[PDB]
């Protein structure tokens, strides 16, 4: 229905706003663009599904997310990829891990405060019906 297409348009507006707020935070700069194969040729042999905030923006516009739960699976993948690739005790790996945990926690905290649970349940029931 037109009403259902209005529901998914409001979902995409909400997701672009949360993603912009994460992308401008200086702590999260390393997560804003794909890893450069030149600088790190090893990356794509270890990490089987790379993800970053520029790719998330592109996915919103391609209509890849029909629920906030779908979107949070890609925020979780940005965080788990950084924990997996940088697991060591040295300061450079510990700083990336603390920033990845802060990106995940910040996205979930903005969603807990600003997403209406009945709006999410509506998106879930339209997705199920298709």
UniProtKB/Swiss-Prot annotation:
- Residues forming the Bromo domain are 3-114
Which tissues carry this protein?
Answer: Highly expressed in estrogen receptor positive breast tumors and in osteosarcoma tumors.
Residue runs in coiled coils: 108-130
Q: What induces or represses expression of this protein, per its UniProt record?
A: Up-regulated in breast, uterus, colon, ovary, and stomach tumors. Induced in breast cancer cells overexpressing NCOA3 or treated with estrogen. Down-regulated in 5-fluorouracil-resistant derivatives of the colon cancer cell line HCT 116.
Compartments where found:
Nucleus
Q: What's this chain's function?
A: May be a transcriptional coactivator of the nuclear receptor ESR1 required to induce the expression of a subset of estradiol target genes, such as CCND1, MYC and E2F1. May play a role in the recruitment or occupancy of CREBBP at some ESR1 target gene promoters. May be required for histone hyperacetylation. Involved in the estrogen-induced cell proliferation and cell cycle progression of breast cancer cells.
* Subunit details: Interacts with ESR1 and NCOA3 and these interactions are enhanced by estradiol. Interacts with acetylated lysine residues on histone H1.4, H2A, H2B and H3 (in vitro).
Q: Which family does it belong to?
A: Belongs to the AAA ATPase family.
- What is the name attached to this protein's record? ATPase family AAA domain-containing protein 2
Biological source species = Homo sapiens
Span covered, complete protein: 981 to 1108 of 1390
